[PDB]
Design a protein around this ligand. Structure first.
Ligand code: MG
Ligand code: MG
Ligand code: MG
Ligand code: MG
Ligand code: MG
Ligand code: MG
Lengths: 63, 144
RNA sequence: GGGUAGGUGGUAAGAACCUCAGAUCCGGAGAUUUCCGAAUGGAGCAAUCCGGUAGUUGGAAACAGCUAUCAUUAAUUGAUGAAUAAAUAGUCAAUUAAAGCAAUACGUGGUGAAGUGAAACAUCUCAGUAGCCACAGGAAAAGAAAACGAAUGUGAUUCCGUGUGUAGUGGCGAGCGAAAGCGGAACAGGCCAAACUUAUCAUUAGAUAGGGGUUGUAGGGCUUGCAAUGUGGACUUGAAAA
RNA sequence: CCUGAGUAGCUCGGAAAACGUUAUUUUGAGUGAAUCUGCCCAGACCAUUGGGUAAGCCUAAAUACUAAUUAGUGACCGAUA
RNA sequence: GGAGAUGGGGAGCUGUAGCGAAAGCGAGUUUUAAAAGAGCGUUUGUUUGUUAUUAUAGACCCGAAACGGGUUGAGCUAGUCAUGAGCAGGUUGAAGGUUGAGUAACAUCAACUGGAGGACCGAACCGACUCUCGUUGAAACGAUAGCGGAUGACUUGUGAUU
RNA sequence: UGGACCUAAGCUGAGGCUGAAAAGCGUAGGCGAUGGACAACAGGUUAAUAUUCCUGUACUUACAGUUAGACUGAUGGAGUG
RNA sequence: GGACUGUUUAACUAAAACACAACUCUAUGCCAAACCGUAAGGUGAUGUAUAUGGGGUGACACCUGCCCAGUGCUGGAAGGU
RNA sequence: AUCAGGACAUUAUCAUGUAGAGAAUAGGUAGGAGCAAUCGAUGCAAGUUCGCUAGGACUUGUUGAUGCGAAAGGUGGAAUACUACCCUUGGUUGUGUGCUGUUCUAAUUGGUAACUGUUAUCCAGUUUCAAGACAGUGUUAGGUGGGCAGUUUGACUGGGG
RNA sequence: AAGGGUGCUUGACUGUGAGACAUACAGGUCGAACAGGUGAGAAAUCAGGUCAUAGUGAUCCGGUGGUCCAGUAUGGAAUGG
């Protein structure tokens, strides 16, 4: 699954409304990056996490 | 973002102060040796109590660093396969760390400074325990 | 329990019996419930094949009868344990849930066409329709205002009529089409987080379990007094009755 | 003293809403506030006036549907129905 | 309420004042400097029944080739893959090698051996060039008679797969 | 002839990887003959069966109990196949 | 005419078409390029420029002339948009 | 993360400029009649920059109290010292940006190797090795793109073209 | 004369329009007469483009100029008319 693991925010499906307004179905994929994390039992883990939650992790100092 | 520095004055003019600019994932964030100050109590609330805790961990940094110096200076023996003195493979910081657990000491391999040993015999390796505290560890490589 | 005098299911006569010590029949509750099948010991060409483990019986022993148990996954608990010393991954054990089916119907949610109309056609419509898929449920979804919207105003949601085929929107073409207001069916609103306080966690708690508190003509906490013992249910166990 | 932060907004691409993207509502990417003298709203927007307090949860009733059990109905069919 | 007529239910609907794009004015009003002129107005209703026509729904009926979505099919055939089987019979007689001559030594030549080849002739086998027949046939593509390959890029069975 | 033995192509596939969803890929294990390994011949009989039944003579693989000898030697290595 | 042996339009065309040996050109320095798949994964290849994919011709012999204005391809380093 | 370079602003700092006449290198608009001396002159030595080969200035060392016809002369369209504001051009400590260019590593990547879970060519974890803030990846935006999709491609017409 | 020359001007007007022509609709054509304020002329009179007949193209959308129009609570504005 190309959704992240902390939350489950998945792709968003929309239209590729070009000039002259021809419609074409298209997908938006979340930005996934392999940044680490540290749990409160040790067990440092590597999880595919999206960037929006990466910022939240960065400010709550969960690394 | 959390502006704080700790344990030294690194690469620029500052002190054990919050004098820290926004770099984000830089020497601020991948350096787990400097404070990540939450500036909701680090104006005067977390000033004096965290300052005294800084001196506490500072003095116990001297303390435990000196204690591990006593452990070091009271020799690491790493045995290896050598062809009349020149080894087949090589003795790097991780082997030196793992063999230092024969002395009960858990040290980070990033404090062991130096380049790969490719020879039997004795080597004095520099250990950067802290910003102003470096120890000499004796490492002995023996043929097996 | 009811209920009598016949009955042993239909193609069905005959043969042989049960029955008026109350059968069959009818209603309630039970037990049995081969094999496959989510199928789940391991397989497999569905309804077959090959087993393990622990008991007991027979047997001198293989071996055969007769019982129970033996899938995976998730949570929790315990034990064990790596490269590496500790620790985690992993492995073993125990207990509790589901996995499936169908009412071709209804609900939500994801994804999502084309035919056709436009007298052709791409914007558009058909249409968020069909289909595929996940998920329940007896109904679901929604929901108690950071609202309506033009006023000495209404006061959760849902559903029906009307507003109206209106205001608007649309290659301003085809077409699309509300929200207010009004009349009605039904009507209930409750509870956490956080301030503060308590107990304990190498209390580095920034954590665990309590008290307390729930919001708009602003409220609650913090200091100090008075009045309260009561309605109320979105609700636990018993008893009695209809 | 407290009154729900990667939050409301702002920007780039899209959509739900009657509206072919526009106040309002949602969001894949980026940035990003304030704290009752506050915050949002009354179709771009500002001031005045007025309304309401998001960013946490729960909720019967009226509503939709009937393969099913029981009783019954039909200006419904009566074996090419 | 007898799966009733009906009773309640005035919320709304049409008509009662039009004109104007609109604020507005009002039996007048818009245009207009204009009170002239012209435009439009200076009352004839409503609710049902029934019928004709019409609108949105397949909309008198039957009739496409097609378009899109989900599934089922490689047991025929095409290719690939694993594994097995088959090719009666008969000829031609390569390269190479041994020996003898010859060569300063090679090269070359002769004999003998050897037994190759997308070789040869031809049955089973495979394929399908021609005529004739049959063409509601024996047969939804064949028969008699001829025909090409037949140790190879061959033929074929069984299983898997796209 | 085939299972109870073996594996090929290949199929399935715990954990795991990837993918809006279903599913797809794939490791250990497991299946999968068209192949490998495994011990029975002749004759007779019935209306219908036959290396199966019967007659005659055989071999195999396990199991105990027994006599004698010997220290066996695998879930793994090698050779053979 | 085609070099040959072969393959092909089952069920009206077996041919002068297709193949082929050989030739040249081009791409490709290894997680190769090309390819299937959305991605994982896989082929290429348990290969490595004396190798692999693609276009074009088509045994063997002799030959393969002229044009780089246009299209395409490769490179360019200052400028213009 | 760090170092270097050059560009444009500016915090602090200097200057910079020759049509003639004008005792001369006249960049423009003012207040302007005096001005200098340890924030140290005449005479000299050196030098960056500049070049009208003559001149300016800045910076230094010695010098020491007498001086400015570049106040008042005189010229000329603009007139001279001294305190200010505005142009052309250069150097400076300084930031602020990005631009190319290095080095380094902890993010990150791996179809380098070793080890364990493990009798496992996937996988997860640890280390090594190579790369290295590039690549790959998400959004956004240009270009080539019948590989692919939906479609139009008229009518009259002594048959139609 | 509706042709040639001259003087003066700009009626190559504003607001309208009874009554007809020819017309499927759309559109086209002609025009007396009335009000405002003008030009030529002594005055009557004439003049709403030329001797007449062609000389041109709907709607939507958007822009430009003026405005005794509206301005999603109010005042403005944006946006429309
Ligand atoms: Mg408003
Ligand atoms: Mg050719
Ligand atoms: Mg040719
Ligand atoms: Mg004329
Ligand atoms: Mg004319
Ligand atoms: Mg207003």
């Amino acid at each position: 699954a190309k959704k992240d693991q902390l939350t489950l925010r998945g792709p968003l499906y929309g239209n590729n409304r070009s000039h002259s307004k021809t419609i074409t179905r298209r997908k938006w994929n979340v930005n996934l990056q392999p940044c680490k994390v540290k749990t409160a039992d040790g067990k440092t883990t590597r999880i595919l996490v999206s960037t929006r939650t990466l910022r939240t992790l960065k400010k709550h100092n969960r690394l | 973002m959390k502006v704080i520095l700790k344990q030294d004055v690194s690469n620029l003019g500052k002190r054990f102060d919050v004098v820290d600019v926004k770099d984000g994932y830089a020497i601020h964030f991948l350096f787990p040796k400097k404070l990540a100050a939450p500036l909701t109590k680090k104006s005067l609330q977390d000033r004096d109590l965290f300052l005294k805790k800084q001196q506490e961990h500072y003095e116990i940094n001297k303390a435990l660093s000196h204690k591990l110096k006593e452990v070091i200076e009271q020799e690491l023996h790493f045995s290896l396969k050598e062809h009349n003195g020149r080894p087949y493979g090589s003795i790097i910081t991780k082997q030196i760390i793992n063999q230092a657990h024969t002395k009960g000491m858990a040290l980070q391999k990033f404090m062991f400074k130096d380049n790969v040993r490719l020879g039997f015999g004795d080597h004095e390796i520099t250990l950067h325990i802290f910003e102003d505290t470096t120890a000499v560890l004796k490492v002995k490589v023996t043929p097996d």
